[PDB]
């Protein structure tokens, strides 16, 4: 699996940030390409040289210079070389572009795009990247259709891999009989797609509306097409670490790549 | 050389987000004491577990539970095995402790102790990891005398070797033949360092003064006895990356060392 990233900058400095983060999710034959928003930040100086550095780390790069350059900028990709695309957007603190957010969220699935959103947690990072949460959503027979998580499942298994840190299914139930299958749905989940080490969690509250967390370096969720985007900022803020939901394009068949 | 933090912890989030920092500066075989501030952040939890995250990744590390209090903590270092030590602060963003961080900063000296003060950028964090500009005051000839300068050269090299980056000595002078003599005597400290590779700039103009510095992940300047956190803070947002600020106990010899 070869994760190929479109990503917007409009901050070269916040791209600086997210640098060892967009390699770690697209190394190694990935690719990432920074679409540039507008140029005080001197986008014209910053973006090249940063493209050629992912070059130099092993992963695919390019770059351009530029809400409705989004859509262009996706538009654009329609029959390019870099395989199947996702859009990397990044959550931030202040609500004032949520609205836009959503719609370019929305926008992303009709280009045939996987979304993943990011919420960086602003004291502790990816902290030691030593530990992923998989929440899995409640569902529990294991179809090629997984529906709305082939992209999550895709990220935790590159994550796991490119960090070797410890990876942890996580889920919830009402019931004893949904525990259970949910537990035999993990187990099998882990076994066919060949990840060793993973540990199972099915827990008796919903991560919402629970108090804590289980503890990890990212916590990485599903996205629902149409997100309340204040859900995933409390989630992080709860979590006290670092979250990152994944939208699939509906195109993805995690298995069969896994 | 070997360097041993003294680290105050209020929110260990913030921990989490420096911990590959803090291993940075010190391994191997350094060591870093986390010293708990007061429990709603429940300390008492996660310092412990953190403390053996040190150990497992080659550093050795202490833990203890609760201003006064970091004299305290200094004042009970004196005989410890851990040799000398550095304290190690991070430059908020709000102003509101800087007289009291100032105060730390200079009772620090008191105590035997070198001080390092961390300036990290909100959006870009250490970026790419990968330039390193060690910043040496106007002075130029070499006595083992450094002055104040020994902590950053030595965390200059400590942090050139564990993250394999490219380093460089930065200074500035007013007239030709102190430019000479500067580029002279950067020359002589890599050489008598054994720092290979190091690139040499002499700068027309004060890094306070000019509107642009030349671009690294990483900054370190020395630390004044009696600082100015403003001079600091504009410094790193300048720079549009992180700084770290190093304070000599007067103790230390670098080239003795290096």
């Not at 409009?10 to 540039?36: A, C, N, Q």
């Not at 919420?119 to 294991?142: F, T, V, Y």
């Not at 299958?181 to 919903?206: D, G, T, Y």
């Not at 990212?218 to 994944?246: Q, T, V």
């Amino acid at each position: 699996w070869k994760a190929n990233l479109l990503v917007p900058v409009e901050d070269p400095r916040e791209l600086m940030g997210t640098f060892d983060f967009l390699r770690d999710i697209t190394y190694p034959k990935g690719s990432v390409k920074l679409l540039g928003l507008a140029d005080k930040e001197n986008l014209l100086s910053q973006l090249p040289s940063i493209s050629e550095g992912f070059q130099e780390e092993g992963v695919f790069s390019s770059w351009t210079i530029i809400e409705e350059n989004l859509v262009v900028g996706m538009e654009a990709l329609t029959g390019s070389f870099f395989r199947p695309s996702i859009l990397f957007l990044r959550l931030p603190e202040n609500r004032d572009r949520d609205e836009e957010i959503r719609e370019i969220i929305r926008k992303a699935s009709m280009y045939r795009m996987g979304v993943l959103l990011f919420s960086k947690h602003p004291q502790a990072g990816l902290g030691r990247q030593n530990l992923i949460n998989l929440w899995i959503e409640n569902r529990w027979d294991i179809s090629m259709e997984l529906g709305n998580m082939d992209l999550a499942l895709l990220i935790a298994y590159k994550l796991k891999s490119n960090w070797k840190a410890s990876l942890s299914f996580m889920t919830f139930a009402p019931t004893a009989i949904q525990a259970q299958a949910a537990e035999n749905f993990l187990q099998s989940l882990a076994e066919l797609a060949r990840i060793p080490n993973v540990k199972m969690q099915v827990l008796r509250e919903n991560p919402i509306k629970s108090s804590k967390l289980p503890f990890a370096s990212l916590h990485i969720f599903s996205l629902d097409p149409n997100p309340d985007l204040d859900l995933a900022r409390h989630l992080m803020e709860k979590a006290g670490s670092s979250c990152i939901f994944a939208l699939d394009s509906g195109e993805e068949n995690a298995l069969a790549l896994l």
